[PDB]
Design brief:
Chains D, G, I: This is Flagellin. The structure is cut from a larger assembly and holds seven copies of chain A and two copies of chain C. By secondary structure, chain A is an alpha+beta fold. Chain A is built from two helices and five strands; from the N terminus they run βββββαα. Chain A is elongated and about 75 Å long. In chain C, helix 1 runs antiparallel to helix 2. The chains are: A alpha+beta, C mainly alpha.
């Protein structure tokens, strides 16, 4: 698995077997483990914020999904409210310019 | 006073046009989609629930 | 001299009209704001809105409240604040708490 | 749950059709009145000076 | 000045812009005051010219 | 009169600013809707996965589908733009001038 | 993006129609005033000799 | 003073020039279907 | 293969009807504006001679 490594150069790493099944290919940089397809050709110089490979069957997945979903809907609500504030401001601006 | 330049009355009328424009837009949108809550602008709490 | 006195009252009428018209419009906007606030409070009554739903309603009401704060500190066509009474040079309402600081004498 | 979701989400055929009607009529009216408003200054032009 | 991604500079620009607006309004009022002075002279001169003839 | 003119022009451009804000907000809303739909489908898959009847190959298929959903999610996050600037590739804070 | 471009780019039917009307009427008035200004010399011309 | 007398006329003219330019711009936009026919309409917004 | 070719070839009737309507409206607007344009400037001159 090949990539543009930390320092800024292009480097290669050899594959290894891992995963929740334990039979998929993984490759490591700096001790962080990644799956080949995710890592392949990746510019690690620029997106260090990149997911790792799993170790186990993720117990309690639905809880995690639901918490994320709640955050999403909170943000959508806030955006809607802000849009409405903008509409009211536009109305007021029109009235004031006419006056 | 018979003012030429400003024609305040037309300016007034334009506002009343825009409000109706917005109303018609919302009505068409909701009637075409089949939903009241199309955007999250419509109803935040409704969106969430 | 009588004619000039009448002209003086004409100017007074002009300059009163300009301010009162504005205040009327702004208060109309305030009225519609309060009406939507009341609308939202009725929604809060429903005893089946779970906590985060109540928080969403709370954000909405926060928006209405700070919009009303905008309206309160509005200004005229010169720059002065209207609802501050005699103290036109400063915004009358504290942004944070709504405490009033402007004049009391109309 | 589907029924409740519908009650929160869906739009009403009849209500929005009626709203569209109101808005359309208002729009046509406003446009006509605007035209008349523009006309008035030409009336004052009729002073011919 | 470029600002994307960087902090501080966006906020510095914002504060500069605010100062800009305040200054522009005060300057506007000042120049209008100058206009008022000139006008105060102007028609007074005209009336005194008529009085002079 | 000159002061009145100044305020009129300022207010008009401020109204245009409000419209800029509505535009950017609506683009963000559009993207978030798709994020939401993907999350809903992911929860559906997680629900399916818990069947003890699934054989391990089937579990691998489910994992494939989930991975592709997550790939699309990161695509939406990074690649959406407005006017050339990206919106959601970070936590961000923005003031629109409406007065 | 189409909506945002539209807001930046497109011209307002009503506003520009009104502006065109104002401009035409001011043009007529200006020309008639111009004719009167041209007459202004003729008075002094006629009276004197 | 033909120029006093013509002050009149010349002044009146200037005003017509202004009005005519405004009419030209109005008809231009009304014909084109766009607010921004050239970068002279809106320099920055045109780029955007 | 038929589906693919269709995706490449076929005109979308909704979009094309929309485009046709837009162009027709623009044509009428242009024609009327041109009508006014010919008259106004040259005509206004004759008032002076």
């Amino acid at each position: 698995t090949k990539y543009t490594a930390d320092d800024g150069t292009s480097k290669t790493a050899l594959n290894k077997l891992g995963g929740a099944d334990g039979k998929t290919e993984v490759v490591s940089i700096g001790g962080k483990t990644y799956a080949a397809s995710k890592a392949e050709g990746h510019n690690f110089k620029a997106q260090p914020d990149l997911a790792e490979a799993a170790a186990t069957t993720t117990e309690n997945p639905l809880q995690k999904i639901d918490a994320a979903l709640a955050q999403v809907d909170t943000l959508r609500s806030d955006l809607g409210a802000v849009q409405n504030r903008f509409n009211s401001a536009i109305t007021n601006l029109g009235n004031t310019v006419n006056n | 006073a018979q003012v030429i330049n400003t024609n305040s009355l037309s300016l007034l009328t334009q506002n009343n046009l825009n409000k109706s424009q917005s109303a018609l837009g919302t009505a068409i949108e909701r009637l075409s989609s089949g939903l009241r809550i199309n955007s999250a602008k419509d109803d935040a709490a409704g969106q969430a629930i | 001299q009588a004619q000039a006195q009448n002209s003086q009252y004409a100017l007074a009428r002009t300059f009163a009209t300009q301010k009162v018209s504005l205040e009327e419009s702004v208060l109309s906007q305030v009225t519609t704001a309060i009406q939507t606030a009341q609308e939202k409070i009725v929604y809060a009554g429903n005893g089946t809105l779970s906590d985060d739903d109540r928080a969403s309603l709370a954000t909405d009401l926060q928006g209405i409240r700070d919009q009303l704060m905008n309206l309160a500190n509005s200004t005229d066509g010169n720059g002065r604040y209207i609802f501050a009474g005699y103290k036109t040079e400063a915004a009358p309402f504290d942004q944070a708490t709504g405490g009033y600081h402007g004049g009391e004498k109309s | 749950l589907t029924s409740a979701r519908s009650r929160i989400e869906d739009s009403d055929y009849a209500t929005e059709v009626s709203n569209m009607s109101r808005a359309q009529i208002l729009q046509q009216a406003g446009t006509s009145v605007l035209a008349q408003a523009n006309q008035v200054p030409q009336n004052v032009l009729s002073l011919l000076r | 000045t470029p600002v994307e991604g960087n902090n501080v500079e966006k906020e510095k620009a914002a504060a500069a812009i605010d100062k800009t607006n305040r200054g522009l309004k005060n300057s506007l009022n000042n120049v209008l005051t100058v206009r008022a002075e000139l006008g105060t002279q102007l028609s007074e001169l005209s009336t005194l010219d008529s009085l002079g003839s | 009169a000159n002061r009145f003119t100044a305020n009129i022009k300022g207010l008009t451009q401020a109204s245009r600013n409000a419209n800029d804000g509505i535009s950017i907000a609506q683009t963000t809303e559009g993207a978030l809707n798709e994020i939401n739909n993907n999350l809903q489908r992911v929860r559906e898959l997680a629900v399916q996965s818990a069947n003890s009847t699934n054989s391990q190959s089937d579990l691998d298929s489910i994992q494939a589908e989930i991975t592709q959903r997550l790939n699309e999610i990161d695509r939406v996050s990074g690649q959406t733009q407005f006017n050339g600037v990206k919106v959601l590739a970070q936590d961000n804070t923005l003031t629109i001038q409406v007065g």
